[PDB]
């Protein structure tokens, strides 16, 4: 039934992205709030997040769950662990793809956080969340009773309605965990099943090579001197400004 709505999103992956206010200082969070749309009524908002919803870590349909990128590994968490608040706790209505339909009150910023193991990942952005009351009586909370009036609300509907955003081949993510010291030289060790692009400034001669097996550069002595790029692009990504562009 709903599996046809995910066939495009199954080809994507979550990604890490910059967030101005994490738990401590600005960081590279797994949940980065790219957009906060609140042009509807009754306080309903549609967030767009670097993490994905509705499908598990392996790409399968798994309902009320998030998959997010943690340093190259797609990790998974039930959606009920997730919390978010603008000026008072919001409520997660549904999540699909990169997008999250929630119910929020007014606020000058929106914060989204969840706890995994002992680390609390949070990301707060200054995008204003509006509460637009329908009609001529400016309520801060919908009434218990009244009359039905015309309104526009972010529907709890994931079907295709003609609005699209773009998929793009991800840029190569640099990773310093791939590079270490051994034999008093720089050794780069790509993750198995993937490839790394290694660019070292050593011996006055730039060396740029692509490797899938451990390599030791005899001409390099300090691991700061060389960069290793996680050359994995099988799964596509939204062209967020927080990621580098592929060639």
């Amino acid at each position, epitope marked *: 039934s709903t599996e046809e709505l995910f066939n495009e999103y199954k080809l994507t992956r979550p990604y890490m992205a910059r967030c101005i206010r994490c738990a401590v200082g600005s960081c590279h969070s797994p949940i980065a709030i790219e957009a906060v749309k609140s042009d509807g009524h009754d306080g309903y908002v549609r967030l767009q997040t670097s993490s994905q919803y509705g499908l598990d870590s392996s790409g399968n349909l798994k309902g009320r769950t998030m998959r997010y990128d943690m340093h190259g590994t797609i990790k998974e968490i039930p959606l009920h662990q997730v919390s978010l608040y603008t000026s008072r706790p919001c409520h997660i209505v549904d999540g699909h793809g990169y997008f999250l339909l929630a119910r929020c009150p007014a606020g000058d910023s929106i914060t989204m956080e969840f706890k995994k193991d002992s680390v609390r990942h949070s990301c707060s952005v200054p995008y204003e969340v509006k509460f637009n009351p329908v009609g001529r009586e400016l309520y801060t909370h919908p009434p218990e009773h009244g009359v039905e009036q015309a309104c526009q609300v972010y529907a709890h509907d994931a079907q295709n309605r003609g609005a699209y955003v773009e998929m793009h081949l991800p840029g190569s993510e640099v990773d310093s965990s791939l590079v*270490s010291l*051994s034999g008093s030289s720089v*050794t780069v060790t790509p993750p*198995d099943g993937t490839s790394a692009l290694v660019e070292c400034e050593c011996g006055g001669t730039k060396i740029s090579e692509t490797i899938n*097996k*451990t*390599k*030791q550069f*005899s001409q390099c002595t300090k691991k700061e001197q060389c960069r290793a790029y996680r050359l994995q692009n099988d799964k596509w990504v939204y062209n967020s400004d927080k990621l580098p562009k592929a060639a």
Partner: antibody, heavy 122, light 105 residues
Framework: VQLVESGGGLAKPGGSLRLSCAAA????????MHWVRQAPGKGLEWVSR????????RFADSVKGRFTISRENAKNTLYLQMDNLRAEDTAVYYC????????????????WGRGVLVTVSS | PMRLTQPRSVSVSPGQTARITCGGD??????VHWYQQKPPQAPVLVIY???ARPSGIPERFSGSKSGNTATLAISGVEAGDEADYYC??????????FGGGTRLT
């Protein structure tokens, strides 16, 4: 840097055995590992290799489809499940480590284990 | 698909220069490694690329290749050279392959 093997000896035709290889002196999780056998009086013969994550494994034609390789990185050990023995498998078996400094893709071997005798006979 | 062929046994005089050959199909492009191996002891690689030695091994050894043949050259033959030697090649077909051990004497 050391590779120390164990588990071989004497076994029966058509049976099962195990060879284990423990590594020290380097970060084992990054390097490919190899098993290479040598019969008495004859030269080296490649048995198999594993690709430092368990994602890829390769075996030779003369031992195709029979034997198994695994590696536990956290415990730092390499297992060759020595199944479906034959008489002419009798040989020494060396655990070896893939070498860096490879230039073009070539699979050099840097450090070799002592070698474990394996005998298959009634 | 590729077989590495070496002379089975070699006779040399101490103090001179000696060579052990290794040949095979498509051997010129593929790397030809060279290993020193006493029959009971563990192998130790003497040449890890077509050209270069690993750290710690004596300088008197040097590989070579031309066309579709390769060589291991020993300068100043020593009793320490009195052991078997092997040429290794890797390919996407069959992965690692060693040749017939050249018994030096």
């Amino acid at each position: 840097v050391q590779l120390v093997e164990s588990g071989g000896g004497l076994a029966k035709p058509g049976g099962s055995l195990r060879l284990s290889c423990a590594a020290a002196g380097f970060r084992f999780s990054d390097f490919h590992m190899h098993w290479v056998r040598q019969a008495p009086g004859k030269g080296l013969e490649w048995v198999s290799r594993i690709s430092h994550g368990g994602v890829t494994t390769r075996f030779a034609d003369s031992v195709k489809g029979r034997f198994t390789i695994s590696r536990e990185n956290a415990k730092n050990t390499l297992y060759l499940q020595m199944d479906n023995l034959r008489a002419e498998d009798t040989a020494v078996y060396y655990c070896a480590r893939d070498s860096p400094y490879w230039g073009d893709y070539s699979h050099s071997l840097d450090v070799w284990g002592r070698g474990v005798l394996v005998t298959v006979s009634s | 698909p590729m077989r590495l062929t070496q002379p089975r046994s070699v006779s040399v005089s101490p103090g001179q220069t000696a060579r052990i050959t290794c040949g095979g199909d498509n051997i010129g492009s593929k790397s030809v490694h060279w290993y020193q191996q006493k029959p009971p002891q563990a192998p130790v690689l003497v040449i890890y690329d077509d050209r270069a030695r690993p750290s710690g091994i004596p300088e008197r050894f040097s590989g070579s290749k031309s066309g579709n043949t390769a060589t291991l050259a020993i300068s100043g033959v020593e009793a320490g050279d009195e052991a078997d030697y092997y040429c290794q090649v890797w390919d996407s077909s069959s992965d690692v392959l060693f040749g017939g051990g050249t018994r030096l004497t």
